[PDB]
Design a binder for these strands. Structure first.
Ligand SMILES: Nc1nc2c(ncn2[C@@H]2O[C@H](COP(=O)(O)OP(=O)(O)CP(=O)(O)O)[C@@H](O)[C@H]2O)c(=O)[nH]1
Lengths: 392, 82, 205, 61, 85
RNA sequence: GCCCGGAUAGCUCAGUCGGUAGAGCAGGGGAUUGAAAAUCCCCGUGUCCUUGGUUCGAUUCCGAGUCCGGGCACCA
RNA sequence: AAUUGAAGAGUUUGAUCAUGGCUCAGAUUGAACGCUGGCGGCAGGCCUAACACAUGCAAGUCGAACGGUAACAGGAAGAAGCUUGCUUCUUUGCUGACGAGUGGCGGACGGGUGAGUAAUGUCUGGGAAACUGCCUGAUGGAGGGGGAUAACUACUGGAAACGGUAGCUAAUACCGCAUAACGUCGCAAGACCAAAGAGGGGGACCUUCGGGCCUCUUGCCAUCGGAUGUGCCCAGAUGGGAUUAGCUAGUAGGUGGGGUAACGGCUCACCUAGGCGACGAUCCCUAGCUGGUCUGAGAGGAUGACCAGCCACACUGGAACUGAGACACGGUCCAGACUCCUACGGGAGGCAGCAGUGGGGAAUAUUGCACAAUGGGCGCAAGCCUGAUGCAGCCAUGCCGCGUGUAUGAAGAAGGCCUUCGGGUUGUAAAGUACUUUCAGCGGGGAGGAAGGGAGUAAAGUUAAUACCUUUGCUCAUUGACGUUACCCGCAGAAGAAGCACCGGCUAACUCCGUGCCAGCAGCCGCGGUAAUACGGAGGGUGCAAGCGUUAAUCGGAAUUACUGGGCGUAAAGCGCACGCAGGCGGUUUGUUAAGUCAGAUGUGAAAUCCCCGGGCUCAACCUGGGAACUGCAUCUGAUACUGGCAA
C-alpha cells in the first residue's frame, strides 16, 4: 503493498538506548506525538509500540519495536530498544542499524552501570552520535543535584570516546508531550531540532558490492519470507539476485520486495533500513545473525586475530583473571557467536583491565573484515570489547 | 453459431493455422465440424505455402458461416482469378 | 559427446586397426598393439558369447564416434527401412556427414573431420552445416567456405586420402577443396570385413 | 525396521531420516534402509569409491 | 459479490416482480375454467375459455410461455369442454 | 524472541539440596564342560557438555552461552 | 509403399532329468533422492489435503437505444487584469466525449479440479414424442396511444453494509387498443395472437424554424426453413468379491388428470399383481470415462498426466429465480461450519482462475510482459475488456542436438602402481610443439512472424445526387509483448566447459595393501571366523555420458492363469459313485429359410496421436501435406456349400 514509497528526504537511522523503566518506550510514543503536531502522520501510543502480553504486563520491552517519522530536514527511522539485563542481546540487534543512538536518562537515577553498558555497546557497533534526553524533568526542581547528574553522563560518554562535553543534553518531560502539552513538547522538540543539527546525513556508499546485516525475520502471510536489515553497503532493487551467506550451508534467493514500513520502494540504496523479501526461502533455513551478500564475493571466513581492549570489574569485564579456553559471546552487531580465546605466549590468564590481543576461532562461520569492532558479552556483563586486526 | 477461423497449432515461434469450420462457442483448438485446408505464415517461398479447399468453404458460406476477417483476408489472397 | 581421450587405447582393446590416429604417419606401430589393452593385457581372455556380441557393438561405435543413446536411434531407424536392417544400419552410419567428409580427405582423422564440420567450414549445396550427424541425401555436393579455406590444416590432411583407396560412391574435385556425392553406399562397398550380424542380435533383446 | 548402511553413523534417538526400499535377507523382518546422504543420517566417513551411494561429496582437497 | 455485473442481479430482481405478477394472472383464468368444468356449466366454461384465450396466448408471444405450452393449455382444456358440452 | 527438561565410564543410566564421582552389562583371566553358554570372583578405562567465579575443595550454588527434545509469543 | 515379425540365465541334490516358484538382464516414468554440472532447441511441471487462504488481476461493452454531464479538451455570452483581446475567468450539455443510472447484449463461453457417480455417466450404432439467442434464405408487416420508475432533488435510518418516504422526467423498458396470415386451437366453422425505432447525407418542397420529406445502412415483429448446439429413448459393450441370493411396493403395467420444449411413475387418483434375478438383480468395496499412452512379435496386461471429446463439481447440504440455454466458478436466497470487520445491535467473504502464501509431503515453478499475432465478448467502426492466448522467468524433469578441441610428440621421463625389481603399465597419454575456434564472453550488423486497419485519393455499384455507405487499386505515417531476437561479422585466446556406476558367477572388465564371521557387502546364489578378483583404500580397466546410479511403479522375460499357447496314474490337482433339470454338443437324406457365416457397396468409425511416401526449422527431436489404417458397428443387395431354424 500500500502507498509506494516517495523519494523525498535522505534517510537517517536513530533510536533509544539506556536503563530499564526509563521511559524509552514512552519517549518513543512522545517524540512522534510532538512531530505529529508538526508534520506528517504518526503519534502511536503505549498500547501500540508495546506488542507482547509479557511487555504490557510488567511494563517492559522484549522485542525491538520500530517507528518512522521525518522532520522538515531529513528522513528518519526510530529504533525503540529494551533496557533489561537479559534483553541486552535485543538492544545490540537494534544497535546494528542506528546511524545515531539516543540515550534516555531518567532525571531520578541518571548515569548507571547498566546505562554504562548501553553506551559502551554503542561505540563497539560503530555509532558515533548520542543525544541524551533527560526524561522526568518535570519531577526534579533541585538543579544542583540535576546539573551534577548531567555532567556525569557527559564524562562517561567522554570515557568511552563519545564527545559528551560537546553533546547537548536535552532536558524535558515526555509524559505531558505524549498526552498533548504545549510546554514540554518544545523540550521534546529540543532533541528533534538537534537531531537535524547534531546528527547529519552520513557517508551513504551505494556504489559498493551489496551486503546487509540480518536484524530479524518476519514471514509475511500471503507474500512469503521477509528478512529485516538496513543496507550496510551496495544497492538492491526488485530484479537482483543475492545469496544467503553465513552460519549454515550458504544458499541463494532473489530480491523481490522492499518496504519502508508499508511504503513500496523500488530501489533500496545504501543506508535504507527496511525489510527485504526472499524468494523460495523457508522460515527455518534463514536465521537471525547471518548476512545477505553479492552472489559469491564473501566466503565463509572462520578464524581471525583481533585487538581486544579487555575491561576490568571497574570497566565492566570479569573481576578475576581467566585462562586459555574462555568461551564468551561475540556480538558482530547481530551475529552472536561463541569463540575460542587463543592466548598469545605472555598472557596466561586475563586480569580485569588488560590491553591485550588474542586469536579467535568461531563456532559458526560469517562475513569477516579487518577493522570489525565487536564487543564481548558473558553472564549479563559485556566482559570485553575488540576490533578485528587479522582475518585468517 | 458456425464460423470459419484459424487454429494456431505447430510449435513455439513457428505457428501454423488449420483453417477450420467450427462452432464459435468452442476454444481456439476445441471442437469443430471439419478442418478445411490450412495455412502456414512462415511459408515464404517454397513448394507448398497455403491451401484452401475453396468449394467446400463456399458451401458453408451459404449455410451461414461467419468468416473471420483474418480468414477472409486469405480468401482475398487466394482469389477466384488470383 | 566425444570420447576426447587416448584414441589408440581403443584400437588395442578391439585389436582391429581403426584409423583413429591416421593423420600423417601410415601405421601406428609404436603402441605395443594387440597385447596391451591396459595394465593386464597379458591375460588371454575367455571372451564369451555375450562379449563377442558386445565387442562388435562397441567397435562400430568406436570407429564412427557415436554414443549409445544416439547409436540405438540409428538402429531404430534401420528396422523401419525396407530391404535388410543390417545393410541400412551400415547405410546410416555411413551417411553421417563427418563420415562423408572423412571419405574426401578433409579431416585426415575422423575426429578432425568432426571438428571441421563443427567450425562451419563444411558446406553442402551452398548451405553451411554445423551438425556432424547431418544425414547426407543421395546426389549432393560438398565444399569449403572462403573464410576457412586452405587454412594450413586442410592442405596437409588432404594428402592422406591421396594415398588411400578413395571409394566408389563419391567423387572429389580437389580444385578448390571441392567434392561431390552420388548414390548411397552398398554393403559390399563398405569396410569389407565388418560383421553387423552380431549387432542385430544384441538389439533384439 | 531399516538397516543403516556404511561404516559409522551419527544418530541420537530423534535424527530425522529418509527411507528407501529393499530387503537385506540377513536380518529377520527388515524390508527397508536409511538413505546415506539425505537428512540427518549423513555421509559415511572417508569413502572414495562409489560416493553417490553413502553420500560423500567430491573431495575439495 | 461486489462486481459491476451486479446490475444483472438487481435487474433480475426487478424482472421477477413483473414476472410473478403476469404469470399469476394467467393461472387464475386457467383455474377459473376448472371451477367451471367441475360445475358442468357448458356455456360458462366456454365463456371462461373464450375469455382466457387472448391472455394465455399473449404470454406466449411475450417471450414467457414457450408458444407450445400455451397451445397445449388450449388443446386439452378444449378437449374437456366439448366433451362436457 | 521467551520459557522448561536433559549432555554422566564403551553403552544404559542413579547420586546434589558444598565433602575428593557410583550400578548393570561390558572386556579379559581363572573354575568348567565331549564344546559352548552360564555362574561366581577382581577393576574405571570418567576433561560429570564447555567456561568463570563464591570457596579450604564445585557434578553440586549460581551467572551465561553450545547442542538436543518439547511448548508459547511478535507478524515488512 | 503403408507392423521385415518371438534370445535367456542363476538357484533345491553327491550328481541328473523333470516339475516348480523366487531373482536378474531390457524398455518406460507428471518421477523422488545422492553425486557432478557447459549451452541450446522442443515439451512437462500439486499424481499428497476436493485443506484452509492476504493482495493484485482473471468480464466487460454500446452515446449509432435514452434521460442526462459529475469531470477533462473545445465553442459561445460575459468577466478581468492589462501584452484590451494577451490572459484570468463566472455562466453554459451547445459540440468532442463520458463517470453514476434505465435498457440491449455477453455474464451458461473460454480457464480449473476429479470429490461423487458401477450407471440417471461414457463410447459405438440406430431412433422420434423435441427445442434452438446470435448467423442466414424466402414470404409479409412495421398503425395509434397510455401509465410508471431509476438516475436527479428534499427529508431520514444505520458505525458501515444498506435502505426508506414524497415529488421530477425519458426511451429500442412496460402495457392495452388495432391489425393479422401457408401461425395457434379445432373435424370444419369460427375464435384469438406481434412489434422498435434510430443514425449518415441531401436538391427541391415544407419550416408551430424540434423537424417534417426523400434515399441509404442497421435493427424490430410474425412464420416456415436451413444450419448449429442442446435435451431425450433404445440395443450391445462398460472393475473385484456369491465368504452379498434374493430384491422392490409410486415399485411393474393399465385407464383418466396434471406437468415438461419433449415421450415417460416425471407426478398424482384408482384398478391389475406383478416387474427384475445365476447370460451375477440387489449389497459392499473401489473408480471419472474415451480417442489414447506404456509394454508386448502378436493376442492381451496395465494405465488413461499432458492434447482433445463427454460427464460431474465450484466452502458443505438444499431450493428457486432471470434467461434461448444454468437449477449457474468471479449470480440470489437459506441453514451450517470456518475466517474477518463491528460504535456489539448487525454485517462481509469463498484461489478446485493465473500468480503467490501457510501447511501436507519424498516431491512440482514468477505476487513477469503484452494485448503484436490467433480466438472470444461488445460495437457501424475505430477501438474498449481478455492471468484465453502469445511469450518470457525458474527446475537437467523428459526428449533431441552440440561442444568441452585437432595434428604431432618415444626421454618411450616424473610421480603412482604391479613385479619373477628383468621389466611392464600409466601412455601419444602428458610436457613441449605446429594448427583451430563451434557454444559461451565482449563490441558491431540483422530477417521473419504483419494480415489488416486509419486518413487522404481515383474509379466502380446504389441513389434525385460529382452527398452518404459498399467494393477494387494507390500513397504517407506507421502497429513486435518476444527482443540486449533466428541468423550473420569481428575479436582475443585451448583459453570457461567431465563426471558417475561397475570389474566372483549371472553381466562387459583386475591385481595389491589393510581389516580378520570384526568392520561391512547384497538383486539372486552368497563373501568375509589372517592370504578377499565379492569388504574399505590405491593403481588399471569396463560401461554410460551432461548425465550416471539407487528407490518406487507398469509391462516384459512369465508357455509361473496357457483364446493364440499349460496340466490332472506318482510332481499341485479326476468330485466316492450314479441319476438327471438349466446349459453346451450331436448321425444320415431331400426341400426351404438366410438367423450365424462369406463377398461387394454405401453411411459412419471426429481431429490429432501410431504407420508409408514427402515438405519445412543448419539437422534432429518437433511441426506438417496426402494416403493407409482405425482390426468395429448399422443397412441394403447377392452366395447359401457349412451350422442352426422349419417341414417330411
Ligand atoms: N513523572 C513522569 N513520569 C514519566 C515520564 N515519562 C514517563 N513516565 C512513566 O515512566 C514509565 C516507563 O515507561 P516505559 O515506556 O515502559 O519504559 P521502557 O523504557 O520501555 C522500560 P523496559 O526497560 O522494561 O523495556 C511509565 O510509567 C511512563 O508513564 C515523565 O516525563 N514524567
Amino acid at each position: 503493498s500500500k502507498e509506494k514509497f516517495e523519494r523525498t528526504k535522505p534517510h537517517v537511522n536513530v533510536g533509544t538506548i539506556g536503563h530499564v523503566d526509563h521511559g524509552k518506550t514512552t519517549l518513543t510514543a512522545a517524540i512522534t506525538t510532538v512531530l505529529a503536531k508538526t508534520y506528517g502522520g504518526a503519534a502511536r501510543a503505549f498500547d501500540q509500540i508495546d506488542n507482547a502480553p509479557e511487555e504490557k504486563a510488567r511494563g517492559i520491552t522484549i522485542n525491538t519495536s520500530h517507528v518512522e517519522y521525518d522532520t522538515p530536514t531529513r528522513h528518519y527511522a526510530h529504533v525503540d530498544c529494551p533496557g533489561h539485563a537479559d534483553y541486552v542481546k535485543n538492544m545490540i540487534t537494534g544497535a546494528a542499524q542506528m546511524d545515531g543512538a539516543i540515550l534516555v536518562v531518567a532525571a531520578t537515577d541518571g548515569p548507571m552501570p547498566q546505562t554504562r553498558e548501553h553506551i559502551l555497546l554503542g561505540r563497539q557497533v560503530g555509532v558515533p552520535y548520542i543525544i541524551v534526553f533527560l526524561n522526568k524533568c518535570d519531577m526534579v526542581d533541585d538543579e544542583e543535584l540535576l546539573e551534577l547528574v548531567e555532567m556525569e553522563v557527559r564524562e562517561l560518554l567522554s570515557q568511552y570516546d563519545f564527545p559528551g562535553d560537546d553533546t547537548p543534553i536535552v532536558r524535558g518531560s515526555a509524559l505531558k508531550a505524549l498526552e498533548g502539552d504545549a510546554e514540554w513538547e518544545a523540550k521534546i522538540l529540543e532533541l528533534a531540532g538537534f537531531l537535524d543539527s547534531y546528527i547529519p546525513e552520513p557517508e551513504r556508499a551505494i556504489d559498493k558490492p551489496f551486503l546487509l546485516p540480518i536484524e530479524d525475520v518476519f514471514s509475511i502471510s500471503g507474500r512469503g519470507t521477509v528478512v529485516t536489515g538496513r543496507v550496510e553497503r551496495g544497492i538492491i532493487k526488485v530484479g537482483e539476485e543475492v545469496e544467503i551467506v553465513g552460519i549454515k550451508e550458504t544458499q541463494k534467493s532473489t530480491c523481490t520486495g522492499v518496504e519502508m514500513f508499508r511504503k513500496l520502494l523500488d530501489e533500496g540504496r545504501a543506508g535504507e533500513n527496511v525489510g527485504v523479501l526472499l524468494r523460495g526461502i523457508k522460515r527455518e533455513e534463514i536465521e537471525r545473525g547471518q548476512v545477505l551478500a553479492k552472489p559469491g564475493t564473501i566466503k565463509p571466513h572462520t578464524k581471525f586475530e583481533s585487538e581486544v581492549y579487555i575491561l576490568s570489574k571497574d570497566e565492566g569485564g570479569r573481576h578475576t583473571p581467566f585462562f586459555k579456553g574462555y568461551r564468551p559471546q561475540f556480538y558482530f552487531r547481530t551475529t552472536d557467536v561463541t569463540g575460542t580465546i587463543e592466548l598469545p605466549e605472555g598472557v596466561e590468564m586475563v586480569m580485569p583491565g588488560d590491553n591485550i590481543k588474542m586469536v579467535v576461532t568461531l563456532i559458526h562461520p560469517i562475513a569477516m573484515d579487518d577493522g570489525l569492532r565487536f564487543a564481548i558479552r558473558e553472564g549479563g556483563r559485556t566482559v570485553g570489547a575488540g576490533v578485528v586486526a587479522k582475518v585468517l | 453459431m458456425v464460423t470459419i477461423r484459424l487454429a494456431r497449432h505447430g510449435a513455439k515461434k513457428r505457428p501454423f493455422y488449420q483453417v477450420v469450420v467450427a462452432d464459435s462457442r468452442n476454444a481456439r483448438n476445441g471442437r469443430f465440424i471439419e478442418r478445411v485446408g490450412f495455412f502456414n505464415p512462415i511459408a515464404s517461398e517454397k513448394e507448398e505455402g497455403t491451401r484452401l479447399d475453396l468449394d467446400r468453404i463456399a458451401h458453408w458460406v451459404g449455410q451461414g458461416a461467419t468468416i473471420s476477417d483474418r480468414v477472409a483476408a486469405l480468401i482475398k489472397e487466394v482469389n477466384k482469378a488470383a | 559427446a566425444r570420447y576426447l581421450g587416448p584414441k589408440l587405447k581403443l584400437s588395442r582393446r578391439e585389436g582391429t586397426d581403426l584409423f583413429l590416429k591416421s593423420g600423417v604417419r601410415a601405421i601406428d606401430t609404436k603402441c605395443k598393439i594387440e597385447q596391451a589393452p591396459g595394465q593386464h593385457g597379458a591375460r588371454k581372455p575367455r571372451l564369451s558369447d555375450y562379449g563377442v556380441q558386445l565387442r562388435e557393438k562397441q567397435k562400430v561405435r568406436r570407429i564412427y564416434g557415436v554414443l549409445e543413446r544416439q547409436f540405438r536411434n540409428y538402429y531404430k531407424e534401420a528396422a523401419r527401412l525396407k530391404g535388410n536392417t543390417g545393410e541400412n544400419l551400415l547405410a546410416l552410419l555411413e551417411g553421417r556427414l563427418d563420415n562423408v567428409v572423412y571419405r574426401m580427405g578433409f579431416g585426415a582423422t575422423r575426429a578432425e573431420a568432426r571438428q571441421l564440420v563443427s567450425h562451419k567450414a563444411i558446406m553442402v549445396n551452398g548451405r553451411v552445416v554445423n551438425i556432424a550427424s547431418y544425414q547426407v541425401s543421395p546426389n549432393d555436393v560438398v565444399s569449403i567456405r572462403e573464410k576457412a579455406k586452405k587454412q594450413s590444416r586442410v592442405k596437409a590432411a588432404l594428402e592422406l586420402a591421396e594415398q588411400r583407396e578413395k571409394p566408389t560412391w563419391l567423387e572429389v574435385d580437389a580444385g578448390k577443396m571441392e567434392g561431390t556425392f552420388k548414390r548411397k553406399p552398398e554393403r559390399s562397398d563398405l569396410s569389407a570385413d565388418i560383421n553387423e550380424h552380431l549387432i542385430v542380435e544384441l538389439y533384439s533383446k | 525396521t531399516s538397516y543403516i548402511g556404511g561404516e559409522g553413523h551419527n544418530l541420537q534417538e530423534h535424527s530425522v531420516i529418509l527411507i528407501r526400499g529393499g530387503r537385506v535377507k540377513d536380518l529377520p523382518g527388515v524390508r527397508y534402509h536409511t538413505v546415506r546422504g539425505a537428512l540427518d543420517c549423513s555421509g559415511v566417513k572417508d569413502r572414495k569409491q562409489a560416493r553417490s551411494k553413502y553420500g560423500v561429496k567430491r573431495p575439495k582437497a | 459479490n461486489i462486481k459491476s455485473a451486479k446490475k444483472r442481479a438487481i435487474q433480475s430482481e426487478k424482472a421477477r416482480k413483473h414476472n410473478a405478477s403476469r404469470r399469476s394472472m394467467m393461472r387464475t383464468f386457467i383455474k377459473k375454467v376448472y371451477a367451471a368444468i367441475e360445475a358442468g356449466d357448458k356455456a360458462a366454461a366456454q365463456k371462461a375459455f373464450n375469455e382466457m384465450q387472448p391472455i394465455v396466448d399473449r404470454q406466449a408471444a411475450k417471450g414467457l410461455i414457450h408458444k407450445n405450452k400455451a397451445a397445449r393449455h388450449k388443446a386439452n382444456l378444449t378437449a374437456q369442454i366439448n366433451k362436457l358440452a
